């Protein structure tokens, strides 16, 4: 059997290359900026025209009573992900302020 002869320490070694730095892409052109602005704008109009959904109302009500941990549990069960819940709570909080 030609397997499992080296230790983990010696398997971790590596050859000394010379690396190339990554080309950063930070510049964003004028036309790309206007494009992003118009999309964010459109998102405002929808919220203005049609308002909040039932679970969003129930959530925001709990935030007024400082029921932070109840709101957390509630949102987790509605959206599934604990990450989506943490994000949606932060967006709702900012809307109320």
């Amino acid at each position: 059997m030609k397997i499992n002869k080296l230790n983990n320490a010696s398997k971790a070694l590596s050859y000394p290359v010379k690396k190339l730095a990554k080309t950063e892409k930070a510049p964003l052109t004028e036309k790309q900026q206007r494009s992003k602005e118009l999309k964010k704008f459109a998102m405002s109009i929808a919220r203005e025209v049609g308002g909040l959904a039932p679970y969003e109302l129930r959530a925001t009500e709990l935030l007024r009573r400082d029921e932070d941990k109840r709101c957390k549990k509630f949102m987790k069960k509605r959206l599934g992900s604990l990450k989506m819940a943490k994000k949606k709570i932060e967006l709702l909080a900012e809307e109320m302020r």
Partner: protein, 199 residues
């Protein structure tokens, strides 16, 4: 053959009309019963807006201004292109939802008309809120056909105007003041009242 009365049409069950011969009647039963349902239930504030429109008198006043900026026909267009370029840039009234929304967004548009009887409505639903945010005056008209007649062609959803000839300026300003009264000035109050069932 015989025209059925309103009472009859409201009585019939559409799901029991089944033969190929009966299809036109099935269509009429559905049309009349839908009307009764929509009158019975409350409208959200944004949909309730399109219940308020200009009188036939105001429509006349507005049309009697706007008609002087009619678009070119194909016959006219051909002649123009055989001749050379001459004179100043014309003023023309503009048409179609795609162009109008662009001109509102670019803050070029100066006054806008919108039609009410449009199906599905989601095409025009957002226009008043956008007009209020850009600060452009507007007015609502009953039918798509009312607009078609202004520009002497097929019905449309909306019309727009981006310029004013000095000749017309006095009348123009008065019209805008009438419109602001019925429409733009009233907006913030309107967005909070639900449409009542109709008596």
């Amino acid at each position: 053959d015989i025209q059925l009365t309103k009472k009859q049409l409201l009585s019939m069950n559409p799901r029991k009309l089944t033969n190929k011969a009966q299809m036109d009647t099935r269509k009429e039963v559905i049309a009349t019963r839908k009307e009764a349902l929509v009158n019975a239930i409350k409208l959200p504030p944004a949909l309730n807006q399109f219940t308020n429109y200009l009188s036939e008198e105001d429509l006349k006043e507005v049309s009697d201004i706007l008609s002087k900026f009619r678009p070119e026909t194909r016959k006219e267009r051909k002649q123009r292109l055989q001749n050379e370029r001459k004179g100043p840039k014309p003023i023309i009234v503009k048409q179609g939802i795609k162009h109008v929304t662009k001109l509102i967004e670019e803050k070029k548009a100066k006054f806008v008309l919108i039609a009410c009887d449009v199906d599905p409505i989601e095409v025009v639903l957002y226009l008043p809120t956008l007009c209020v945010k850009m600060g452009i005056p507007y007015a609502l008209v009953k039918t798509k056909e009312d607009l078609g007649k202004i520009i002497k062609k097929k019905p449309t959803t909306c019309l727009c105007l981006c310029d004013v000839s000095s000749d017309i300026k006095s009348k123009f300003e008065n019209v805008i003041a009438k419109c602001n009264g019925q429409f733009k000035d009233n907006y913030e109050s309107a967005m909070k009242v639900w449409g009542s069932p109709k008596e």
